[PDB]
Write a protein that binds this DNA or RNA. Structure first.
Lengths: 57, 188, 64, 144
RNA sequence: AGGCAUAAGGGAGCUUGACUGCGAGACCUACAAGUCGAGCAGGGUCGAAAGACGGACUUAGUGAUCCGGUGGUUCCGCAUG
RNA sequence: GACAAUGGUAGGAGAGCGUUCUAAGGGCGUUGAAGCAUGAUCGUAAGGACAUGUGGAGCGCUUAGAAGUGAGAAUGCCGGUG
RNA sequence: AAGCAGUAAAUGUGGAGCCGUAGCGAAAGCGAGUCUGAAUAGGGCGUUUAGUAUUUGGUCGUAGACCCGAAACCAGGUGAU
RNA sequence: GUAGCGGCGAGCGAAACGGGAAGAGCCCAAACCAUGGGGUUGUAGGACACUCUCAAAGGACGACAUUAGACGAAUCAUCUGGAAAGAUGAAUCAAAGAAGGUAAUAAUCCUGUAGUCGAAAAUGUUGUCUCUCUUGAGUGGAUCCUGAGUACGACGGAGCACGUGAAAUUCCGUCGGAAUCUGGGAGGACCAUCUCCUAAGGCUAAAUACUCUCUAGUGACCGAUAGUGAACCAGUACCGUGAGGGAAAGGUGAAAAGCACCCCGGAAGGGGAGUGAAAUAGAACCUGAAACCGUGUGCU
């Protein structure tokens, strides 16, 4: 129930693989972090991904 | 002629044509429920061991009263085919058989203003015709189909619709002076 | 549905123009020091499948 | 005659219907013998491979590769041509029409399995070395 | 174990056939395998020569397939080189 | 005609009988169909007829075709009764 | 073949496609030959040339696959009267 | 069942070409103007210069269709009969010889069918009129736009027929990180030449899949242990705390004419008399097998 606020970055699921290729379901979380985005009305802290913090706030 | 009306009555092929003609005319809308389809089931009525009775899996096995049917009617089709040359050969045998006998009797194009079965039955009776006659006309006709298709045994049909089943069903043909050339031009 | 062919049999055999099979010899991968020259040179030719093999596997190869 | 219908003689049989008594022959064990794996419903060693000894087609080495750009042709001997006349410039589309060729796989290739005793002027993609000489013996110069 | 004193046992001189391409035919054998093999072509060693030589007197010293590695070459190399 | 053969499980081959439905043909049926019962009938077998009672409205025969096509065993299933 | 027309019909049309008339080789490739090979020297496979379409029967394959019968395993839920 | 993928095992398994059903394309961002105009793309298009004649969204507008219906040809008599449709004589209709019923087997007895006529009202689909709404082009080439944390790469995965493989073409996570028309991508590693296309925004009918429901109709489909579990007051008796499991059960006769009255009996049930063609058709009601249970006798 968590994603980016500037984009739609969500965790996903895939396999984890051994040396003998045994698979086991694991997940892939987005590098989500609280940040007071200074959006209209009020500085709101939300879960922005570390990818959407590179160039333009 | 003798390429169409003088050929041998090839019976090994005429029979296959008749059998095909009738097998292609079944529906096969008939089904039956197996173990999967019959309602209920899915519980073992008692223990595998320790009761005096026979070991039984579900109440809907074959032997149980009310069970599923093991094999049986499947919803399927019966139509098949054969080579085209054999089709034309059978449809020529079916007419050479009438020409061997006196089944065929040519006439001219009919004349009607509106459909009426009285004059049609009269004409059929004034031509010494047996009960079931096949009235083969050149094109589809309205003033003939209607005044013919109330009678017990009269089947009107066009050169576009000649059948190995229905030539041999009848024993008296009534073709026109125009449709016969149609069939000899078409048939090989 | 269509009968699937055995895809490992097709790599190992071809169809002569009579209805028999042109297989490839064995004992021809490694350990060539343990074989006579008359026996290495002999395994280099090809041979057919016997009758009994065609008994076992003849419809595994039915589209070849 | 739709009530006297005889099929050809030897063209229809009864199906064998096993499991209907000892007199037919296939009554009790229905042709399957006694106990085993080949007497169960659905029971049967799969074809070729079986579960035990090493099979044949997993014991013989693989051989060769297969080319993608194969490009094989439609063969024509000197006898498929004999159905023609003299003069008769021959086109690879024409030769498809007279009942000889039905598929230019990668062109037609004229082969020399026969003899002409004719005079045609053949055009095609690839020729033999016997076919070319057999054509040139009767004039009718060949060309690609 | 069967053979070997014509030696197949011992010694000496030269030498590399413990060669390349095969192979009518046969033995064995469920199959895969195994065994033998005259003769032909190419290149040679020993002998004056006729000839012999495709390891060892014979029968044990071995291990499919797939997979990976090294050498070579007429092959193929996904529009084209 | 003459001569030969004719025990048989697993198994192979062939020829048939019967049920249900379909097409065509040709029948029968309240002066009584199927069905049931009874018999001392006919065929090499599976089977078929006929007479007789009961029954009260549908059935066979010929040639083909199509099968949910044949029951004594499954501590079978359901019902009835010992 | 699909499709199109036609009584949910047979039929008509529809030659995309499939098999056969040519094989041999891993392939390039040659072709009544080809491949191996320095060499049809020999050898292997071929030149068998009658096949193809539909259908009856026998057998096999993918389907539950002659019928009945587990111990179990997994997913969703129901239960502390 | 090809290419190919595969402890190269068991198995998995394409696509383009070709033949067909159906078949239309459009709107944005940016450059440039004054939130509106402006503009859509690869034969490179647009802005700027020359002229030069689904695609917006609601409404009004008459013929068919669905939702009840109507007319609808033509037969009598004799025998058996309980009763005629049967049978025997003759007669007629038919664009109507579907089928159901009727005291037995009906083209002509009824309900119908062919065929034709019918719609206050409601809804549905198509026709034109209204209301809309729209300026379309053609050359040029200075310069200006043509989708950026994007494509792509690295590492870990998923998916493509393709198991990480020499894995091209795509998606995801985490990091690094481009070019801007001689630009960029693809043509199964990669490179160069050619050939094709123009990503990083979107919207699009038809051919196609299915059937809870409705309307006709079909069946070499069942016919009461069959067919739906359920032909019958069936998801019901019943069973379980619960989720849940789940049956059995049709047939008098043409018509109830369903047995007045008498007798035995407390009644139930009988025996008569009746009804009926038939009561051993009496509501447990078509036929009525076998098991089983009885009564009598011919031989023993």
């Amino acid at each position: 129930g968590k994603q980016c606020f500037v984009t739609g970055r969500k965790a996903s699921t895939g396999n984890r693989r051994s040396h003998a290729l045994n698979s086991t379901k694991r997940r892939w979380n987005a590098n989500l972090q609280k940040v007071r985005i200074l959006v209209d009305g009020k500085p709101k802290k939300v879960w922005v991904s570390a990818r959407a913090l590179k160039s333009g706030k | 002629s003798d390429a169409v009306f003088g050929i041998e009555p090839n019976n090994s092929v005429l029979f296959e044509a008749i059998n095909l003609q009738r097998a292609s005319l079944r529906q096969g809308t008939h089904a039956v429920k197996n173990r999967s389809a019959v309602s209920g089931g899915g519980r073992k009525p008692w223990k595998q061991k320790g009761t005096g009775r026979a070991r039984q899996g579900t109440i809907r096995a074959p032997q149980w009263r009310g069970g599923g049917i093991v094999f049986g009617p499947t919803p399927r089709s019966y139509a098949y085919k054969m080579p085209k040359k054999m089709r034309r050969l059978a449809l020529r045998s079916a007419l050479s058989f009438k020409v061997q006998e006196n089944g065929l009797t040519v006439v001219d194009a009919f004349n009607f203003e509106a459909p009426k079965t009285k004059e049609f039955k009269n004409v059929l009776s004034t031509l010494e015709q047996p009960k079931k006659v096949l009235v083969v006309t050149e094109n589809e006709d309205v003033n003939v189909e209607l005044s013919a298709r109330n009678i017990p045994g009269v089947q009107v049909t066009t050169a576009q619709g000649l059948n190995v089943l229905d030539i041999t069903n009848a024993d008296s043909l009534v073709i026109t002076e125009a449709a016969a050339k149609k069939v000899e031009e078409v048939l090989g | 549905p269509k009968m699937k062919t055995h895809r490992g049999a097709a790599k190992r055999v071809k169809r002569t123009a009579s209805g028999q099979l042109k297989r490839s010899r064995a004992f021809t991968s490694h350990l060539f020091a343990n074989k006579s020259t008359k026996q290495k040179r002999q395994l280099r030719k090809a041979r057919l499948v016997s009758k009994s093999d065609m008994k076992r596997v003849k419809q595994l190869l039915a589209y070849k | 005659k739709l009530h006297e219908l005889k099929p050809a003689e030897g063209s229809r049989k009864e199906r064998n219907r096993v499991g209907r008594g000892v007199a037919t022959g296939n009554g009790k064990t229905s042709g399957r013998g006694h106990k085993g794996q080949k007497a169960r419903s659905g029971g049967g060693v799969r074809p070729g491979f079986e579960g035990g000894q090493l099979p044949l087609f997993r014991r013989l080495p693989k051989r060769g590769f297969t080319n993608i750009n194969r490009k094989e042709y439609a063969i024509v001997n000197l006898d498929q041509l004999n159905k023609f006349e003299d003069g008769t410039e021959v086109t690879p589309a024409l030769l498809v029409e007279s009942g000889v060729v039905k598929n230019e796989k990668s062109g037609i290739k004229i082969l020399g399995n026969g003899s002409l005793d004719k005079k045609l002027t053949v055009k095609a993609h690839k020729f033999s070395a016997s076919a070319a000489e057999a054509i040139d013996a009767k004039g009718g110069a060949h060309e690609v």
